[PDB]
Tab-separated table of C-alpha atoms and ligand atoms in Angstrom:
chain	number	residue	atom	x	y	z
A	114	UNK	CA	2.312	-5.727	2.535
A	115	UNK	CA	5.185	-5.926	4.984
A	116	UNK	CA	7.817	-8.154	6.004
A	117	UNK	CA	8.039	-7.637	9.950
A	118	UNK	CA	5.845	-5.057	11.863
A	119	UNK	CA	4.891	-4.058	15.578
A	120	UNK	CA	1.801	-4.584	17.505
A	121	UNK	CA	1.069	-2.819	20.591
A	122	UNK	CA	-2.387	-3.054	23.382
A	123	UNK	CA	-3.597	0.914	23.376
A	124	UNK	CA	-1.542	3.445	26.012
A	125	UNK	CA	1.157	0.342	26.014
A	126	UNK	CA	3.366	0.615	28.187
A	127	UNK	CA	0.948	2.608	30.685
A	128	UNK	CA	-2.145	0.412	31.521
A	129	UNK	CA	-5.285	-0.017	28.829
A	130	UNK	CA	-8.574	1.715	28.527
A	131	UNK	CA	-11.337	-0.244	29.362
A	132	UNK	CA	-14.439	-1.092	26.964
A	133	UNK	CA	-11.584	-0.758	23.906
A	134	UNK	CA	-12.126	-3.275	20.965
A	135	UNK	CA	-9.110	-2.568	18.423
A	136	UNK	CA	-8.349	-4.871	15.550
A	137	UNK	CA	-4.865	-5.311	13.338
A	138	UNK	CA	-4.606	-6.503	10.021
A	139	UNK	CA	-0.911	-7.894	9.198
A	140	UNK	CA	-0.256	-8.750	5.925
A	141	UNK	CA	3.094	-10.463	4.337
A	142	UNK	CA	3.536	-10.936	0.420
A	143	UNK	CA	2.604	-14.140	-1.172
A	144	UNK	CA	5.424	-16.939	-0.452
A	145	UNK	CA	5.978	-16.078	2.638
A	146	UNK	CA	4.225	-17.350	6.244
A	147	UNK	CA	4.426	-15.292	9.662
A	148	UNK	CA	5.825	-15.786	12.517
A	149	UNK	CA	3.981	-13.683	15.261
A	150	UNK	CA	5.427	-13.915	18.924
A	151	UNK	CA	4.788	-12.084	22.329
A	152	UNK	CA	7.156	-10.543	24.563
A	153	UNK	CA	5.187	-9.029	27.516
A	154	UNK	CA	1.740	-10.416	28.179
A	155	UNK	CA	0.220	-8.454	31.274
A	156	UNK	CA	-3.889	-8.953	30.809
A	157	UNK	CA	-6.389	-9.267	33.210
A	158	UNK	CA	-6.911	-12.903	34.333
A	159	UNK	CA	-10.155	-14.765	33.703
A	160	UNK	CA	-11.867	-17.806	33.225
A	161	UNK	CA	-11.928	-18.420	29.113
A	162	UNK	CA	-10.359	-15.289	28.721
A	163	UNK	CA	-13.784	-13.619	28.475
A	164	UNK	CA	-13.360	-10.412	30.075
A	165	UNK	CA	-10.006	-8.837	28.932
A	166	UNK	CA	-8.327	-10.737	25.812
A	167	UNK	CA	-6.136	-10.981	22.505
A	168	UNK	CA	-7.075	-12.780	19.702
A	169	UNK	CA	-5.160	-14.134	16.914
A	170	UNK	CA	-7.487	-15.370	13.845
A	171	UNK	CA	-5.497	-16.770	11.094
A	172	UNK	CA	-7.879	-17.757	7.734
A	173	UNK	CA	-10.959	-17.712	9.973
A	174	UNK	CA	-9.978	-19.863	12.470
A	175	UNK	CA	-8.635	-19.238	16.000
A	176	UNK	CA	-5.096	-19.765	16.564
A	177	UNK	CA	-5.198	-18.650	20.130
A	178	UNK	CA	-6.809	-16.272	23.268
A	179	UNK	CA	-4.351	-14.786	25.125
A	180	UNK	CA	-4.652	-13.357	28.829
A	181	UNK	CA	-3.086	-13.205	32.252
A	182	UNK	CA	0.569	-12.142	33.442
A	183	UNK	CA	3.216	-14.162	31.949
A	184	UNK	CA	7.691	-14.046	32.338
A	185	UNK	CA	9.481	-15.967	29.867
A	186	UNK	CA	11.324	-19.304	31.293
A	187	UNK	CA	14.975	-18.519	29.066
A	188	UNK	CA	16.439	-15.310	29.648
A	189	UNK	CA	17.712	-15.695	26.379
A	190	UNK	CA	14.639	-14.637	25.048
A	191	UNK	CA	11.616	-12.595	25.828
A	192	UNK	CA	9.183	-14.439	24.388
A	193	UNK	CA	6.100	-15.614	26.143
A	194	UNK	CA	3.502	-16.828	23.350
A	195	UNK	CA	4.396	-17.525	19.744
A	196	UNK	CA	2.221	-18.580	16.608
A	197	UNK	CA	3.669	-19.449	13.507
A	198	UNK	CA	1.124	-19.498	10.482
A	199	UNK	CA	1.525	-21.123	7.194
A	200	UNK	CA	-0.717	-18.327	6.077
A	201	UNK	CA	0.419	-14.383	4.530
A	202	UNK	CA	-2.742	-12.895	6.081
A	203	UNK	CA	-3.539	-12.417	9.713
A	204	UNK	CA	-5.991	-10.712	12.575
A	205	UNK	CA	-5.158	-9.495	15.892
A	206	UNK	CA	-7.718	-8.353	17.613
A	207	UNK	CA	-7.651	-6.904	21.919
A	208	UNK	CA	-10.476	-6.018	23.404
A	209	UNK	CA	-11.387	-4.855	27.477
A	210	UNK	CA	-14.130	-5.449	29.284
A	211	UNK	CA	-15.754	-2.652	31.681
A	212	UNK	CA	-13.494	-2.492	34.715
A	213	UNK	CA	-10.089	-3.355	35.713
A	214	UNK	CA	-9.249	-4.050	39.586
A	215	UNK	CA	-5.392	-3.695	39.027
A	216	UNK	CA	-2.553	-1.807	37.015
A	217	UNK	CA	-2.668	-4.055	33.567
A	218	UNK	CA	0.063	-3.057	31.202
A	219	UNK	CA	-1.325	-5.159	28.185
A	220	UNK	CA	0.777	-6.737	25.499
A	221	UNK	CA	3.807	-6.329	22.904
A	222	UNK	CA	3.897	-8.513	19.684
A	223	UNK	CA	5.885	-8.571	16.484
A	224	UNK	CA	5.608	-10.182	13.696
A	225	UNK	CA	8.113	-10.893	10.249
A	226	UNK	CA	7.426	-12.998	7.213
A	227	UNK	CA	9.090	-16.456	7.069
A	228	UNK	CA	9.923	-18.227	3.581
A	229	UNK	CA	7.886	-20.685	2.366
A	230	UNK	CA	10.614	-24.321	1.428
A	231	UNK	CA	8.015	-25.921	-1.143
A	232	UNK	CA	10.590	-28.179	-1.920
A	233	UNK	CA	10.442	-30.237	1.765
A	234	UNK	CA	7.347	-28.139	3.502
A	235	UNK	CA	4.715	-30.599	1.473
A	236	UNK	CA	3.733	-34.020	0.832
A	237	UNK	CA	4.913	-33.879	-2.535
A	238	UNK	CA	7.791	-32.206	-4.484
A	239	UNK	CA	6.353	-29.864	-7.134
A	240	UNK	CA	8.781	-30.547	-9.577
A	241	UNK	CA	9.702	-33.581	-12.044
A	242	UNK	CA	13.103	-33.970	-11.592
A	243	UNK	CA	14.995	-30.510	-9.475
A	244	UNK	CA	12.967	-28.223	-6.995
A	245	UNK	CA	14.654	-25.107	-6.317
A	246	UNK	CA	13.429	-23.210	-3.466
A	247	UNK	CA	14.642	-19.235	-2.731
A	248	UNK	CA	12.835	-16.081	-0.390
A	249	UNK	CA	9.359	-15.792	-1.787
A	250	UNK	CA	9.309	-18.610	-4.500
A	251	UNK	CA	10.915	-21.613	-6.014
A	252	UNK	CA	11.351	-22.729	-9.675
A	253	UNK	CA	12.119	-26.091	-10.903
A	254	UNK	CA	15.493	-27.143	-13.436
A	255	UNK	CA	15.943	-29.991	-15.508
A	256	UNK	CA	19.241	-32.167	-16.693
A	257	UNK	CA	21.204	-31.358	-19.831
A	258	UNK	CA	19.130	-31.537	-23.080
A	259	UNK	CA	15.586	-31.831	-20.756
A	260	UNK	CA	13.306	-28.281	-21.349
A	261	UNK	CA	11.035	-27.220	-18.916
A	262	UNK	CA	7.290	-27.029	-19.784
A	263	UNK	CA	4.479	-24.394	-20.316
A	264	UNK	CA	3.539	-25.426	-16.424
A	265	UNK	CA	6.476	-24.836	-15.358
A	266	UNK	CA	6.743	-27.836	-13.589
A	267	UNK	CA	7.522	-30.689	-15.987
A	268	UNK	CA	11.114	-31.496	-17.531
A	269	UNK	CA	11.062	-33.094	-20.854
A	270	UNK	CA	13.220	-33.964	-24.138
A	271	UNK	CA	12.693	-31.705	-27.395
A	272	UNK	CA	12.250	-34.331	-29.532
A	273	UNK	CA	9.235	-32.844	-31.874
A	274	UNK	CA	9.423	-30.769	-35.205
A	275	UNK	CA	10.568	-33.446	-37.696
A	276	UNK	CA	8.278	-33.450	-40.214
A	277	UNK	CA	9.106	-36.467	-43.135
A	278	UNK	CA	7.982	-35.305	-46.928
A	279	UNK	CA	10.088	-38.312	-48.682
A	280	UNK	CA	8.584	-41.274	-49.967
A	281	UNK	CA	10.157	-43.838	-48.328
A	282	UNK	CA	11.859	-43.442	-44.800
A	283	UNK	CA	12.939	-44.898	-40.873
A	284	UNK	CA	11.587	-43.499	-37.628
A	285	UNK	CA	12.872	-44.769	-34.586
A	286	UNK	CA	12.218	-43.650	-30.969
A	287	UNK	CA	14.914	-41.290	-29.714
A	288	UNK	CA	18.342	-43.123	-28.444
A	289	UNK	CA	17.281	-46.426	-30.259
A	290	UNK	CA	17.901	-48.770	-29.115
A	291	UNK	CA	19.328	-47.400	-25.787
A	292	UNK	CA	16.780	-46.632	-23.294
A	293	UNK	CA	13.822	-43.192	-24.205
A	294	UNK	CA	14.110	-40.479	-22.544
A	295	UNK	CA	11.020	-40.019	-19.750
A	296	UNK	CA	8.604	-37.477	-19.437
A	297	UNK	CA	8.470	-36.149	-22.788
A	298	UNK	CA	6.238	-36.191	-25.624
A	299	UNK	CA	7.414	-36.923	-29.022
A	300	UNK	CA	5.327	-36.033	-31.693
A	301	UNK	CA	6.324	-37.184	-35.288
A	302	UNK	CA	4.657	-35.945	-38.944
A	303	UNK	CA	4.808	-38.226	-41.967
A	304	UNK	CA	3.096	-35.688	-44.741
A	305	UNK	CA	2.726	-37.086	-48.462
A	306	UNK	CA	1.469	-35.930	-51.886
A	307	UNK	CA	-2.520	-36.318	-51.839
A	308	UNK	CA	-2.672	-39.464	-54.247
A	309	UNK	CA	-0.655	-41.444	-51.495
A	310	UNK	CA	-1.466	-43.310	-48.577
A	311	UNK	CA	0.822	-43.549	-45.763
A	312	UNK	CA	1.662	-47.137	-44.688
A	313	UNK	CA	3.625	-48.167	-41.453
A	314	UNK	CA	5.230	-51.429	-40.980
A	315	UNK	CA	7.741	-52.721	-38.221
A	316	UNK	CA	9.098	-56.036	-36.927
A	317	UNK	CA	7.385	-57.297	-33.507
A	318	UNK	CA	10.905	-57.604	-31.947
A	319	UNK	CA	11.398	-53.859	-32.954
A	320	UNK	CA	8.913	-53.018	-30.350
A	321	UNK	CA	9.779	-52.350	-26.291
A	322	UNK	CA	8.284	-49.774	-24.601
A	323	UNK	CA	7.491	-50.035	-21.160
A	324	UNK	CA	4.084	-52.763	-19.997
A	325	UNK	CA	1.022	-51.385	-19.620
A	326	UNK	CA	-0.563	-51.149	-15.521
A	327	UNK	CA	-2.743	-53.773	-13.681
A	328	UNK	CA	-5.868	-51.935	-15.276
A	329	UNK	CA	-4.270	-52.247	-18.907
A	330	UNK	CA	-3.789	-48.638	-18.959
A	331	UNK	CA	-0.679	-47.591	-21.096
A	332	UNK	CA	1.515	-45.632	-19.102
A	333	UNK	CA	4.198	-44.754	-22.184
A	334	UNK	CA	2.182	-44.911	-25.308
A	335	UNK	CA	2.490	-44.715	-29.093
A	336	UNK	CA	-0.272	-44.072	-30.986
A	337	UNK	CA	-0.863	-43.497	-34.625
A	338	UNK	CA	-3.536	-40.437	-35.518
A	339	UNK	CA	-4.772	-39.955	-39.433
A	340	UNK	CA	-7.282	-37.672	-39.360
A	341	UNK	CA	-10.038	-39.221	-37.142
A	342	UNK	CA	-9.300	-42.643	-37.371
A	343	UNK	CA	-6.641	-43.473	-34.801
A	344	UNK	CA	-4.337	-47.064	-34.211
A	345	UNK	CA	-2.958	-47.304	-30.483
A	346	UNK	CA	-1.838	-46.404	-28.389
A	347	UNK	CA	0.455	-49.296	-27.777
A	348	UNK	CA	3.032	-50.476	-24.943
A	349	UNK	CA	4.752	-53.746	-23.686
A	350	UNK	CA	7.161	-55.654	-24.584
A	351	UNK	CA	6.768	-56.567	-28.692
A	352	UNK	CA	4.688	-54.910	-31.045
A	353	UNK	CA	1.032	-55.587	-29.795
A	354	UNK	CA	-0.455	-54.309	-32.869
A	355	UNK	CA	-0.859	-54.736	-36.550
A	356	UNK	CA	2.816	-55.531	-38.256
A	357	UNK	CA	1.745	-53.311	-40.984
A	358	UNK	CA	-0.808	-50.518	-40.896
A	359	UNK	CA	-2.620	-49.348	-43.974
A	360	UNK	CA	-3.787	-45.676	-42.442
A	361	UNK	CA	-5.780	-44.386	-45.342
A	362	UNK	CA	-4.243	-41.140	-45.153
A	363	UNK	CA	-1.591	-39.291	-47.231
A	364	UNK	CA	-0.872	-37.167	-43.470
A	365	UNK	CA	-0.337	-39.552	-40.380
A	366	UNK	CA	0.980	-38.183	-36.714
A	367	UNK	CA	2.587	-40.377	-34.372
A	368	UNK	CA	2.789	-39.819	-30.808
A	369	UNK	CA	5.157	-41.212	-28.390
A	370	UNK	CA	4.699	-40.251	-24.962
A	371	UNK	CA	6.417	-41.667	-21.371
A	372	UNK	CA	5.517	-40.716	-17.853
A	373	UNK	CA	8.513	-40.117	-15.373
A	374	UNK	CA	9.797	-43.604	-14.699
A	375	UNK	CA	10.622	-46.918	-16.398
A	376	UNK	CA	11.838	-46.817	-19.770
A	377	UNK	CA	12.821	-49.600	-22.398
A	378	UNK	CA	14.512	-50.558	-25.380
A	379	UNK	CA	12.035	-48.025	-27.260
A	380	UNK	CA	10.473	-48.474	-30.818
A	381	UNK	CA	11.673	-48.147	-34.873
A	382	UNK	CA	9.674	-48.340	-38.187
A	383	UNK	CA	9.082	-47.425	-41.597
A	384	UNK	CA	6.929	-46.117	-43.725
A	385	UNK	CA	6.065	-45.754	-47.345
A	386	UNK	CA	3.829	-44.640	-49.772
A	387	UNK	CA	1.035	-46.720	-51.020
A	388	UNK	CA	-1.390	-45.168	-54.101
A	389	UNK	CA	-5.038	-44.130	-53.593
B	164	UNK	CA	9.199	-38.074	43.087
B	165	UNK	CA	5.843	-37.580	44.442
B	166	UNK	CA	3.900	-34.847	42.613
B	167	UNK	CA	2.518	-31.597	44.431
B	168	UNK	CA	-1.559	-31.450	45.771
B	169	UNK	CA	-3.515	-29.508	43.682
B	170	UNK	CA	-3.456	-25.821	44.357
B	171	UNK	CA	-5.959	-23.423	46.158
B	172	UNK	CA	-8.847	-22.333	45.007
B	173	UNK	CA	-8.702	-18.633	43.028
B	174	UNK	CA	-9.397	-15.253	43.900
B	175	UNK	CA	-12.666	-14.346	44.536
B	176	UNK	CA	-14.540	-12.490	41.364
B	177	UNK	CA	-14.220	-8.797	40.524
B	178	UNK	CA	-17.205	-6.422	41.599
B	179	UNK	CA	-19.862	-6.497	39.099
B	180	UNK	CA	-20.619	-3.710	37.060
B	181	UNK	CA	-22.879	-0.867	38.266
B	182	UNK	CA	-26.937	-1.424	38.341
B	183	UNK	CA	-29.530	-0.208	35.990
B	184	UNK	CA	-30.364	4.051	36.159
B	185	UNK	CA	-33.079	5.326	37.702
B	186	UNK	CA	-36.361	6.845	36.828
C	27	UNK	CA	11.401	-34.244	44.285
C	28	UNK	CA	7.975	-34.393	42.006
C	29	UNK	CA	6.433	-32.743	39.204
C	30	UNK	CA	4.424	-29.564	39.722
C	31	UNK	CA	0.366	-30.542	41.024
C	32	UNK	CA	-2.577	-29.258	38.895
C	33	UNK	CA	-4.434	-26.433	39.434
C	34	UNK	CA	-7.172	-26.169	41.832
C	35	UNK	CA	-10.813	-24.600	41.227
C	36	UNK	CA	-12.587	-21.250	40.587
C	37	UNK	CA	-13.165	-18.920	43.734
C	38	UNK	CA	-16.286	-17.866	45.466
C	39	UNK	CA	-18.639	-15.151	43.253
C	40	UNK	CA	-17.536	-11.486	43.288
C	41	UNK	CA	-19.563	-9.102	45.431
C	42	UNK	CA	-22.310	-7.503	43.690
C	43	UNK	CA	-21.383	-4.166	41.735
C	44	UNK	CA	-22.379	-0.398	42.783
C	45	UNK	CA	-25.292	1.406	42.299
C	46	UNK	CA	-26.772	2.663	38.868
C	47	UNK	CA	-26.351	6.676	38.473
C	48	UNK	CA	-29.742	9.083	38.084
C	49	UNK	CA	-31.684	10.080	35.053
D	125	UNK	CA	7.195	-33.916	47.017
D	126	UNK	CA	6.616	-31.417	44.270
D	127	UNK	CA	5.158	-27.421	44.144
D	128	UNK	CA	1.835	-27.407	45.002
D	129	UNK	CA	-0.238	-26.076	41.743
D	130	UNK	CA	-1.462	-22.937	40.839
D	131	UNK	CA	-3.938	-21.292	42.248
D	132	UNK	CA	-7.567	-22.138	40.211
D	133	UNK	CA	-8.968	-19.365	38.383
D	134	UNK	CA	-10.797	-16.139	39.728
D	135	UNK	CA	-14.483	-16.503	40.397
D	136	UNK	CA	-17.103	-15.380	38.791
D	137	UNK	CA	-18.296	-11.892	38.002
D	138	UNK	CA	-20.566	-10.086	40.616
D	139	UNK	CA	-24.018	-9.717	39.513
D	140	UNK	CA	-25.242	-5.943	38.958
D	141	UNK	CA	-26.006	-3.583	41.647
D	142	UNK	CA	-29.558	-2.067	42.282
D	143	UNK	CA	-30.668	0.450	40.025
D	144	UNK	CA	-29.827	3.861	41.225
D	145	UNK	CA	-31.884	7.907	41.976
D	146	UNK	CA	-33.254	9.850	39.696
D	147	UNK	CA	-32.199	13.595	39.189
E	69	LIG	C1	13.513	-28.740	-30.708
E	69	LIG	O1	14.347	-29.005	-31.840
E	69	LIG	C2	13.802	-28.543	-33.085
E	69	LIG	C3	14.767	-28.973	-34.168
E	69	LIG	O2	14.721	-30.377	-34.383
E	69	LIG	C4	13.594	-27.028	-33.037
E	69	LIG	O3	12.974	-26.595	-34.240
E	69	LIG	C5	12.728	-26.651	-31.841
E	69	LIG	O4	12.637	-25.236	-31.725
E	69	LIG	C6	13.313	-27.235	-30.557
E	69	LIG	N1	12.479	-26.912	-29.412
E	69	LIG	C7	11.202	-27.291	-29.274
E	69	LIG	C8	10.520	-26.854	-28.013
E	69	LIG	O5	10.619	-27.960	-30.125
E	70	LIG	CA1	-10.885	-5.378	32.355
E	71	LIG	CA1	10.330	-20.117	-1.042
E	72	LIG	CA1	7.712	-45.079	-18.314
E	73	LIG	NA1	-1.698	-1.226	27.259
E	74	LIG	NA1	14.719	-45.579	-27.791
């Protein structure tokens, strides 16, 4: 693994053996591509490039066959033939057929790694909300009070870990009734003495989370789990469920969970504790 | 302007390789 | 004046190679 | 008018000579 490197046709700068077939492996770390480039090109001349040649096979497909005598047009540069790969791996291979009629001096080529910008060099932007690109890599960054996410690609709110023991009690979504967060996942536990039964009622108008998609598919969701059973997961605007929810369960978790755009009012309810 | 004709023909092919040995 | 013209075709065959050696 | 354009490429390889003595 290197980061630039020389390539050079046998005997170079004298004239090349015939019946030679040498072969060069360049290699560049991961997060990096290669830009390879020629500065003197003197090969013998043929049809196809079938007789005398230099290959360059990048993955395992051709990126060019090189022969002839070549000048550069700038004489700010030397370079005749360039290739720039998107790949860390490459294969140059020269090879000389039996005879040559004149004084061919071969080739010179160098190679060094080039950064990979996976913020702007794709189709899409790895990242929820920052993409931070730097030699080698990138990593992603979220706003103030947003965590980053076991992928390592996702930004979200902590907004889990409250778990409610008392009888009798209010759960609203977070910044009620200013707008939820987006992309997170809340995740709310209501846990009870045994002989209870946890029992969840709200007001319709208390309800405004975000409409569900042509296919009624919820794209932010709350959902009620006990166990099993399970009530949800519900979306749009006013409570499109039961006004109050008997769940048959003395444990109940309730999951609130928004994709990366549009959010609403957001949700509140309560809970209490009904006997067995 | 008006475009240059299109070159000569190339250089005539190399010498082929030596024949076959003998017996 | 115009742009360069294209490139014109392949030569005439190359003369047939040497003799094979003994053996 | 414009350069004339390059010269087409070489011809094609002789074919083999004869085969040869034998020592
Ligand atoms: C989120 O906040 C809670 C406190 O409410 C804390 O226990 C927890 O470690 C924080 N982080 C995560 C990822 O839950
Ligand atoms: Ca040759
Ligand atoms: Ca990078
Ligand atoms: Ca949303
Ligand atoms: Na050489
Ligand atoms: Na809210």
């Amino acid at each position: 693994p290197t980061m630039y490197g020389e390539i050079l046709s046998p005997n170079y700068p004298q004239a090349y053996p015939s019946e030679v077939e040498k072969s060069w492996d360049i290699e560049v770390p991961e997060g990096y591509g290669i830009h390879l480039y020629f500065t003197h090109l003197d090969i013998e001349l043929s049809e196809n490039c079938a007789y005398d040649s230099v290959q360059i096979i990048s993955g395992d497909t051709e990126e060019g066959r090189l022969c002839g005598q070549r000048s550069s047009n700038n004489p700010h540069s030397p370079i005749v033939e360039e290739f720039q790969v998107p790949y860390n791996k490459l294969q140059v291979i020269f090879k000389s057929d039996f005879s040559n009629e004149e004084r061919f001096t071969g080739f010179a080529a160098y190679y060094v790694a080039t950064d990979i910008n996976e913020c702007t060099d794709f189709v899409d932007v790895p990242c929820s909300h920052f993409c931070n690109n730097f030699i080698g890599g990138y990593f992603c960054s979220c706003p103030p009070e947003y965590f980053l996410h076991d992928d390592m690609k996702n930004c979200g709110v902590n907004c889990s870990g409250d778990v409610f023991t008392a009888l009798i009690g209010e759960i609203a979504s977070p910044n009620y009734p200013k707008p939820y967060p987006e992309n997170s996942r809340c995740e709310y536990q209501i846990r009870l003495e045994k002989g209870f039964q946890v029992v969840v009622t709200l007001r319709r108008e208390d309800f405004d989370v975000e409409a569900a998609d042509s296919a009624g598919n919820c794209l932010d969701s709350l959902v009620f789990v006990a166990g099993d059973r399970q009530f949800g997961p519900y979306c749009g605007h006013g409570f499109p469920g039961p006004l109050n929810i008997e769940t048959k369960s003395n444990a109940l978790d309730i999951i609130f969970q928004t994709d990366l755009t549009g959010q609403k009012k957001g949700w509140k309810l309560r809970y209490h504790g009904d006997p067995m | 302007g008006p475009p240059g004709p299109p070159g000569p023909p190339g250089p005539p092919g190399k010498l082929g390789p030596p024949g076959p040995p003998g017996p």
